């Protein structure tokens, strides 16, 4: 009936400071399909694109939200997810290393 | 490359409902059909297949009348059977071309995140262990000869003729091969004197791939596979990790096998 989102964050390319890149936030395994996914730079929402919502064999949903970014020394990134199974918006930090 | 047409329908109250469609062929998405829109959209130049504009227009009209009728018909089942709110309905329908000339098609559906009913040969069959009322929804749906006929036609004439043509127009894009980048990083500490070795592989199409941590020709176990995750350009991403003693880190490598590379694996040594 009800499933919480799994969330993974990763960049498209090797994360080299200075070089333009793509930040990906991948939200999956959830249900109901109603969801909100924001990509944040140092806490502030950035301009991002979302794929069409879709679902897997077992009826759970998934969604890819990506945005352009240029990683550097100081700036830290993250993904915020609001879903009906989460009392507070869940936040997942981007770890360049993982 | 199998074909999957996908419907996501949300009924929250009775003033507010939405129904979205999209379709996959292999890993690629040649169609979308947004609630706001009375027409499907072709996302690729090959999306139109061999269907003529007339066949597309007819298939569209059918589906658009379907969407309208599906909407009101669910609402009637809702009011006249006092079912809960909100409701999430999903439908999956498609086919694949098997060898010789045999082709198997399907249409199953889901209520509240799990199987509820499907379509077998000529009739609606309920799914085992489903909410009480759907045996009674199946009663009504089986008394509607027209809908049953139209579904049969779709599964047995329309999907197979559509997929044959789109498999043809989309051949070069479907069968293309994109080589991955790969790179290593040191990840969060598994403990004092330990390292998380992380091998990243990104940008391969298609999806099947094999990425392992190695010491020579012996695969290192302790290797934890990530999930394979999409990038926006229809390529993929995977990270594979190893929890190892900082002492034994010398001589380890990450090996990447992918259909795009041949028998020429990408190899990366830990430096
Ligand atoms: C190209 C990518 C787009 C992806 C699209 C996703 C594919 C979805 C599958 C498409 C289904 C096609 C079936 C079409 C059959 C159809 O038209 N059904 C309609 C239209 O019928 C109307 O017109 C007809 C002739 O013009 C008759 O005169 C009818 O009396 C009138 O009502 C039919 O009435 C009705 O909407 C069928 C509803 C099917 C519901 C089965 C789904 C299971 C959901 C179970 C939910 C459980 C209940 C919760 C309360
Ligand atoms: C049907 O559902 C939607 C929510 O799914 C309701 O819309 C909200 O209503 C409030 C108060 O009027 C608005 O301020 C919000 O902006 C709406 N939110 C959304 C997400 O749509 C709607 O009121 C419901 N209608 C009925 C008659 O129950
Ligand atoms: C979606 O489409 C239907 C039918 O065209 C329309 O009446 C309805 O208002 C739309 N729903 C939403 C949530 O925008």
Coordinates of C-alpha atoms and ligand atoms in Angstrom, one line a residue:
Chain A
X1 CA 0.0 0.0 0.0
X2 CA 2.6 2.6 1.2
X3 CA 6.3 2.6 0.5
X4 CA 9.0 5.2 1.5
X5 CA 11.4 6.7 -1.1
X6 CA 14.9 5.5 -1.5
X7 CA 17.2 8.3 -2.5
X8 CA 20.6 8.3 -4.1
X9 CA 22.7 11.3 -5.2
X10 CA 25.6 11.1 -7.6
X11 CA 27.1 13.3 -10.3
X12 CA 27.1 12.4 -14.0
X13 CA 30.8 12.8 -14.5
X14 CA 33.9 12.5 -12.3
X15 CA 33.5 15.5 -10.0
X16 CA 36.4 17.9 -10.9
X17 CA 36.3 21.3 -9.2
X18 CA 35.7 24.0 -11.9
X19 CA 34.4 21.6 -14.6
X20 CA 30.7 21.9 -15.4
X21 CA 28.8 18.7 -14.5
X22 CA 25.3 17.2 -13.8
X23 CA 24.0 16.5 -10.3
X24 CA 21.6 13.6 -10.2
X25 CA 19.1 12.8 -7.5
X26 CA 17.4 9.5 -8.0
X27 CA 14.2 8.8 -6.0
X28 CA 12.6 5.3 -6.3
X29 CA 10.7 2.5 -4.6
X30 CA 8.0 4.8 -3.4
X31 CA 4.1 4.8 -3.4
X32 CA 1.8 6.9 -3.6
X33 CA 3.3 8.6 -6.7
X34 CA 2.7 12.1 -5.2
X35 CA 6.3 13.4 -4.4
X36 CA 8.4 16.5 -4.4
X37 CA 12.1 16.5 -5.2
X38 CA 14.3 19.6 -4.8
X39 CA 18.0 19.9 -5.5
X40 CA 19.8 22.3 -3.1
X41 CA 23.0 24.3 -3.3
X42 CA 24.0 25.3 0.3
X43 CA 20.3 25.0 1.3
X44 CA 18.8 27.0 -1.6
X45 CA 16.7 25.4 -4.4
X46 CA 18.4 25.3 -7.8
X47 CA 17.0 25.0 -11.3
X48 CA 16.5 21.3 -12.1
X49 CA 14.8 18.9 -14.5
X50 CA 12.7 16.0 -13.7
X51 CA 12.0 13.0 -16.0
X52 CA 8.4 11.7 -16.4
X53 CA 7.2 9.6 -13.5
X54 CA 7.5 5.9 -14.1
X55 CA 7.1 2.5 -12.3
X56 CA 8.9 -0.9 -12.1
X57 CA 7.6 -4.5 -12.2
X58 CA 6.3 -4.3 -8.6
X59 CA 4.3 -1.0 -9.1
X60 CA 6.6 1.3 -7.1
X61 CA 7.6 4.6 -8.6
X62 CA 10.8 6.3 -9.6
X63 CA 11.9 9.7 -10.8
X64 CA 15.2 11.3 -11.9
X65 CA 15.8 14.8 -11.0
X66 CA 19.0 16.4 -12.4
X67 CA 20.5 19.9 -12.5
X68 CA 23.6 21.5 -13.9
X69 CA 26.3 22.5 -11.3
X70 CA 30.0 23.3 -11.0
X71 CA 31.5 21.6 -8.0
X72 CA 34.2 23.4 -6.1
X73 CA 36.0 23.5 -2.7
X74 CA 33.4 25.4 -0.6
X75 CA 29.9 24.7 -2.0
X76 CA 27.9 21.7 -0.7
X77 CA 24.9 20.1 -2.5
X78 CA 22.0 18.0 -1.5
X79 CA 18.5 16.6 -2.4
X80 CA 15.3 17.3 -0.4
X81 CA 12.4 14.9 -0.7
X82 CA 8.9 15.4 0.6
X83 CA 6.6 12.4 0.6
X84 CA 3.5 11.4 2.7
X85 CA 5.6 8.8 4.5
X86 CA 8.0 11.4 5.8
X87 CA 6.9 13.7 8.7
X88 CA 9.9 16.0 7.9
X89 CA 11.3 16.5 4.4
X90 CA 14.1 14.0 4.0
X91 CA 17.5 15.5 3.0
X92 CA 20.4 13.7 1.4
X93 CA 23.8 15.2 1.0
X94 CA 25.9 14.9 -2.0
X95 CA 29.2 13.1 -1.2
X96 CA 31.6 13.7 -4.1
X97 CA 33.5 10.6 -2.8
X98 CA 30.5 8.3 -2.7
Chain B
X1 CA 13.5 -5.1 -26.6
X2 CA 10.0 -5.5 -25.1
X3 CA 7.3 -2.8 -25.2
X4 CA 5.5 -1.4 -22.2
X5 CA 2.7 1.1 -22.2
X6 CA 2.2 2.5 -18.7
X7 CA -0.8 4.3 -17.1
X8 CA -0.7 6.2 -13.7
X9 CA -4.0 7.4 -12.5
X10 CA -4.6 9.4 -9.3
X11 CA -8.0 9.9 -7.8
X12 CA -7.7 12.1 -4.8
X13 CA -11.2 13.4 -4.2
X14 CA -13.9 13.8 -6.9
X15 CA -13.1 17.2 -8.2
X16 CA -9.4 16.3 -8.7
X17 CA -8.0 13.4 -10.7
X18 CA -5.2 13.0 -13.1
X19 CA -4.1 10.2 -15.5
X20 CA -0.6 10.1 -17.1
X21 CA 0.8 7.8 -19.7
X22 CA 4.2 6.8 -21.0
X23 CA 5.7 3.9 -23.0
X24 CA 9.0 2.1 -23.0
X25 CA 10.6 0.2 -25.8
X26 CA 13.7 -1.6 -24.5
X27 CA 15.2 1.0 -22.2
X28 CA 14.1 4.0 -24.3
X29 CA 10.9 6.1 -23.9
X30 CA 9.4 6.9 -27.2
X31 CA 6.1 8.3 -25.9
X32 CA 4.5 10.4 -23.2
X33 CA 0.9 11.3 -22.6
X34 CA 0.3 14.0 -20.0
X35 CA -3.1 14.6 -18.4
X36 CA -3.0 18.2 -19.7
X37 CA -2.9 17.0 -23.2
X38 CA -5.4 15.4 -25.6
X39 CA -2.6 13.9 -27.7
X40 CA 0.3 11.6 -27.2
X41 CA 3.7 13.1 -27.9
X42 CA 6.5 11.4 -29.9
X43 CA 9.8 11.9 -28.1
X44 CA 12.1 10.6 -30.9
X45 CA 12.2 10.9 -34.7
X46 CA 11.6 7.1 -34.9
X47 CA 8.6 7.1 -32.4
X48 CA 6.0 7.2 -35.2
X49 CA 7.0 3.7 -36.4
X50 CA 5.4 2.5 -39.6
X51 CA 1.9 3.5 -38.6
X52 CA 0.3 6.1 -40.8
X53 CA -1.1 9.4 -39.5
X54 CA -4.5 7.9 -39.8
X55 CA -3.7 4.8 -37.8
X56 CA -2.2 7.1 -35.2
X57 CA -5.2 9.3 -35.1
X58 CA -7.5 6.4 -34.7
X59 CA -5.5 4.8 -32.0
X60 CA -5.4 8.3 -30.3
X61 CA -9.2 8.7 -30.4
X62 CA -9.7 5.3 -28.9
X63 CA -7.3 6.1 -26.1
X64 CA -8.7 9.5 -25.4
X65 CA -12.2 8.2 -25.2
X66 CA -10.8 5.5 -22.9
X67 CA -9.1 8.0 -20.6
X68 CA -12.4 10.0 -20.2
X69 CA -14.5 6.9 -19.7
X70 CA -12.0 5.4 -17.3
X71 CA -12.1 8.5 -15.3
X72 CA -15.9 8.6 -14.9
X73 CA -16.3 4.8 -14.6
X74 CA -13.9 4.6 -11.6
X75 CA -15.8 7.4 -9.9
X76 CA -19.0 5.5 -10.3
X77 CA -17.4 2.4 -8.8
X78 CA -16.2 4.7 -6.0
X79 CA -19.6 6.3 -5.1
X80 CA -21.7 3.2 -5.7
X81 CA -19.3 1.0 -3.6
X82 CA -18.1 3.6 -1.0
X83 CA -14.4 2.9 -1.6
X84 CA -11.7 4.9 0.1
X85 CA -9.8 8.1 -0.9
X86 CA -7.3 8.9 -2.4
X87 CA -7.0 6.0 -5.0
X88 CA -4.0 5.1 -7.0
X89 CA -4.6 3.0 -10.1
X90 CA -1.8 1.9 -12.4
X91 CA -2.0 -0.1 -15.6
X92 CA 0.8 -1.9 -17.4
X93 CA 0.2 -3.2 -20.9
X94 CA 2.6 -4.3 -23.7
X95 CA 4.2 -7.1 -25.7
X96 CA 7.4 -8.5 -27.0
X97 CA 8.3 -10.3 -30.3
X98 CA 9.5 -13.9 -29.6
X99 CA 11.3 -16.0 -32.2
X100 CA 9.5 -17.5 -35.3
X101 CA 6.3 -15.4 -35.4
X102 CA 4.8 -15.9 -31.9
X103 CA 4.1 -12.7 -29.8
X104 CA 2.7 -12.6 -26.3
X105 CA 0.8 -9.5 -25.1
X106 CA -0.5 -8.5 -21.6
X107 CA -2.6 -6.0 -19.5
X108 CA -2.4 -6.2 -15.7
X109 CA -3.4 -3.5 -13.3
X110 CA -2.8 -2.4 -9.7
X111 CA -4.9 -0.9 -6.9
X112 CA -3.1 0.7 -4.0
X113 CA 0.3 -0.6 -5.1
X114 CA -0.4 -4.2 -5.7
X115 CA -1.9 -6.5 -8.4
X116 CA -5.6 -6.4 -8.7
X117 CA -6.8 -7.8 -12.1
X118 CA -5.5 -8.6 -15.5
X119 CA -6.7 -9.6 -19.0
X120 CA -6.5 -13.2 -20.2
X121 CA -7.2 -14.3 -23.8
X122 CA -10.7 -12.9 -24.0
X123 CA -11.8 -11.9 -20.5
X124 CA -11.0 -10.0 -17.3
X125 CA -9.5 -12.2 -14.6
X126 CA -9.1 -11.0 -11.0
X127 CA -5.7 -11.4 -9.2
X128 CA -5.5 -13.8 -6.3
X129 CA -6.1 -12.3 -2.8
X130 CA -7.5 -8.9 -3.8
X131 CA -9.9 -6.5 -2.0
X132 CA -13.5 -7.8 -1.7
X133 CA -15.2 -5.4 -4.2
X134 CA -13.1 -6.1 -7.3
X135 CA -14.7 -9.5 -7.8
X136 CA -17.8 -7.4 -8.3
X137 CA -16.0 -4.8 -10.5
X138 CA -14.9 -7.8 -12.6
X139 CA -18.6 -8.8 -12.8
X140 CA -19.5 -5.5 -14.6
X141 CA -16.4 -5.3 -16.8
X142 CA -17.2 -8.8 -18.1
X143 CA -20.7 -7.6 -19.1
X144 CA -19.2 -4.9 -21.4
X145 CA -18.6 -6.8 -24.7
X146 CA -17.3 -3.6 -26.4
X147 CA -14.5 -2.8 -24.0
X148 CA -13.5 -6.5 -23.9
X149 CA -13.4 -6.5 -27.7
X150 CA -11.5 -3.3 -27.9
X151 CA -8.9 -4.6 -25.4
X152 CA -8.4 -7.8 -27.4
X153 CA -7.8 -5.9 -30.6
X154 CA -5.3 -3.6 -28.9
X155 CA -3.3 -6.4 -27.5
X156 CA -3.5 -8.7 -30.5
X157 CA -3.5 -6.3 -33.5
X158 CA -2.3 -2.8 -32.4
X159 CA 0.6 -3.5 -30.1
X160 CA 2.2 -6.1 -32.3
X161 CA 1.9 -4.0 -35.5
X162 CA 3.1 -0.9 -33.6
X163 CA 6.1 -2.7 -32.0
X164 CA 7.2 -4.4 -35.3
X165 CA 7.4 -1.0 -37.0
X166 CA 9.0 0.9 -34.1
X167 CA 11.6 -1.9 -33.6
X168 CA 12.5 -1.2 -37.3
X169 CA 12.6 2.7 -37.2
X170 CA 14.4 2.7 -33.8
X171 CA 16.9 -0.1 -34.6
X172 CA 20.0 2.0 -34.8
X173 CA 19.2 4.0 -31.5
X174 CA 18.1 0.9 -29.6
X175 CA 21.1 -1.2 -30.6
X176 CA 23.7 1.5 -30.0
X177 CA 26.6 1.1 -27.6
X178 CA 28.0 3.7 -25.4
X179 CA 31.2 3.2 -23.5
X180 CA 31.5 4.1 -19.8
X181 CA 33.9 6.5 -18.0
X182 CA 35.2 5.0 -14.8
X183 CA 37.0 6.4 -11.8
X184 CA 38.1 5.6 -8.3
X185 CA 37.5 7.5 -5.0
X186 CA 38.1 7.0 -1.3
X187 CA 34.7 6.9 0.5
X188 CA 33.4 7.3 4.1
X189 CA 35.6 5.4 6.7
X190 CA 34.4 1.9 7.6
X191 CA 36.6 2.2 10.7
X192 CA 40.1 3.1 11.9
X193 CA 42.7 1.6 9.5
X194 CA 40.0 0.7 7.0
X195 CA 39.1 2.2 3.6
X196 CA 36.0 2.2 1.5
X197 CA 37.3 1.8 -2.0
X198 CA 34.7 3.1 -4.5
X199 CA 34.7 2.4 -8.1
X200 CA 32.4 4.5 -10.2
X201 CA 31.2 3.6 -13.7
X202 CA 29.0 6.0 -15.6
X203 CA 27.7 6.7 -19.1
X204 CA 27.2 3.1 -20.4
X205 CA 24.3 2.1 -22.6
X206 CA 22.8 -0.5 -22.6
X207 CA 22.3 -1.5 -19.0
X208 CA 23.8 -5.0 -18.6
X209 CA 27.3 -4.5 -17.1
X210 CA 29.7 -6.2 -14.7
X211 CA 32.0 -4.3 -12.3
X212 CA 34.2 -6.1 -9.8
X213 CA 37.0 -5.3 -7.4
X214 CA 40.0 -7.5 -8.2
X215 CA 43.3 -8.8 -6.9
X216 CA 44.8 -10.2 -10.1
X217 CA 42.4 -12.8 -11.6
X218 CA 40.8 -13.5 -8.2
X219 CA 37.6 -11.5 -7.6
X220 CA 37.6 -9.8 -4.2
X221 CA 34.5 -10.7 -2.2
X222 CA 33.3 -8.0 0.2
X223 CA 32.5 -6.2 -3.1
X224 CA 29.1 -4.5 -2.5
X225 CA 27.2 -3.7 -5.7
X226 CA 25.2 -0.5 -5.9
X227 CA 22.0 -0.3 -7.8
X228 CA 22.3 0.7 -11.4
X229 CA 20.9 4.2 -11.7
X230 CA 19.9 6.3 -14.6
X231 CA 21.5 9.4 -16.0
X232 CA 19.4 12.0 -17.9
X233 CA 20.9 11.0 -21.3
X234 CA 19.6 7.4 -21.1
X235 CA 23.0 6.1 -20.0
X236 CA 23.6 4.5 -16.6
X237 CA 25.6 4.8 -13.4
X238 CA 26.8 2.2 -10.9
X239 CA 29.1 2.4 -7.9
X240 CA 30.8 -0.7 -6.5
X241 CA 32.5 -0.6 -3.1
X242 CA 35.1 -2.5 -1.0
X243 CA 35.6 -2.4 2.8
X244 CA 39.3 -3.2 3.1
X245 CA 42.2 -2.8 5.6
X246 CA 44.3 0.2 4.6
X247 CA 47.3 -2.2 4.8
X248 CA 46.0 -4.6 2.1
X249 CA 45.1 -1.9 -0.4
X250 CA 48.1 -2.4 -2.7
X251 CA 47.5 -4.4 -5.9
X252 CA 43.7 -3.9 -5.9
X253 CA 41.9 -2.9 -9.0
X254 CA 38.4 -2.3 -10.4
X255 CA 37.5 -4.1 -13.5
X256 CA 34.7 -3.0 -15.8
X257 CA 33.0 -5.4 -18.3
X258 CA 30.5 -3.9 -20.7
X259 CA 29.0 -5.0 -24.1
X260 CA 30.4 -1.7 -25.6
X261 CA 34.0 -2.5 -24.8
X262 CA 34.2 -6.0 -26.4
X263 CA 36.7 -8.2 -24.6
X264 CA 38.7 -5.1 -23.8
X265 CA 37.7 -4.4 -20.1
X266 CA 38.4 -1.1 -18.5
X267 CA 40.9 -1.7 -15.6
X268 CA 41.7 0.8 -12.8
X269 CA 44.4 0.2 -10.1
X270 CA 44.2 1.9 -6.7
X271 CA 46.9 4.6 -6.5
Ligands
LIG1 C1 1.1 5.3 -26.2 C2 1.5 5.4 -24.8 C3 0.3 5.8 -23.9 C4 0.2 4.7 -22.7 C5 -1.3 4.4 -22.5 C6 -1.5 3.4 -21.4 C7 -2.3 2.2 -21.9 C8 -3.6 1.9 -21.1 C9 -4.3 0.7 -21.6 C10 -5.4 1.2 -22.6 C11 -6.7 0.5 -22.4 C12 -7.5 0.5 -23.7 C13 -9.0 0.0 -23.5 C14 -9.9 0.7 -24.4 C15 -11.4 0.3 -24.1 C16 -12.3 1.4 -23.9 O1 -12.5 2.3 -24.7 N1 -12.9 1.4 -22.7 C17 -13.8 2.4 -22.1 C18 -14.6 3.2 -23.2 O2 -15.9 2.8 -23.3 C19 -16.8 3.8 -23.9 O3 -16.9 3.8 -25.3 C20 -17.2 2.5 -25.9 C21 -17.2 2.4 -27.4 O4 -16.8 3.7 -27.9 C22 -18.5 1.9 -25.3 O5 -19.6 2.4 -26.0 C23 -18.6 2.1 -23.7 O6 -19.9 1.9 -23.2 C24 -18.2 3.6 -23.3 O7 -18.2 3.7 -21.9 C25 -14.7 1.7 -21.0 O8 -16.0 2.3 -21.0 C26 -14.1 1.9 -19.6 O9 -13.4 3.1 -19.4 C27 -13.1 0.7 -19.3 C28 -12.3 0.9 -18.0 C29 -11.2 -0.2 -17.9 C30 -10.9 -0.3 -16.4 C31 -9.9 -1.5 -16.2 C32 -8.7 -1.0 -15.4 C33 -8.6 -1.7 -14.0 C34 -8.7 -0.7 -12.9 C35 -9.2 -1.4 -11.6 C36 -9.5 -0.4 -10.6 C37 -10.3 -1.0 -9.4 C38 -11.5 -0.1 -9.2 C39 -11.2 1.1 -8.2 C40 -12.6 1.8 -7.9
LIG2 C1 -9.3 17.9 -4.0 O1 -8.0 17.7 -3.7 C2 -7.0 18.7 -3.7 C3 -5.8 18.2 -3.0 O2 -5.4 17.0 -3.6 C4 -7.5 20.0 -2.9 O3 -6.8 21.1 -3.4 C5 -6.2 21.9 -2.3 O4 -7.1 22.8 -1.7 C6 -6.6 23.8 -0.8 C7 -7.7 24.5 0.0 O5 -8.7 24.8 -0.9 C8 -5.7 24.7 -1.7 O6 -5.3 25.8 -0.9 C9 -4.5 23.9 -2.2 O7 -3.7 24.7 -2.9 C10 -5.0 22.6 -2.9 N1 -3.9 21.7 -3.0 C11 -3.7 20.8 -4.0 C12 -2.5 19.9 -3.9 O8 -4.4 20.7 -5.0 C13 -9.0 20.3 -3.2 O9 -9.4 21.2 -2.3 C14 -9.9 19.0 -3.1 N2 -11.2 19.4 -3.4 C15 -12.3 18.9 -2.7 C16 -13.6 19.4 -3.2 O10 -12.2 18.1 -1.7
LIG3 C1 -6.7 16.4 -16.1 O1 -7.5 16.1 -17.2 C2 -8.9 16.1 -17.0 C3 -9.6 15.6 -18.3 O2 -9.2 16.3 -19.4 C4 -9.4 17.4 -16.5 O3 -10.8 17.6 -16.5 C5 -8.8 17.6 -15.1 O4 -9.1 18.8 -14.5 C6 -7.2 17.4 -15.1 N1 -6.8 17.1 -13.8 C7 -5.8 17.9 -13.1 C8 -5.5 17.4 -11.8 O5 -5.3 18.9 -13.6

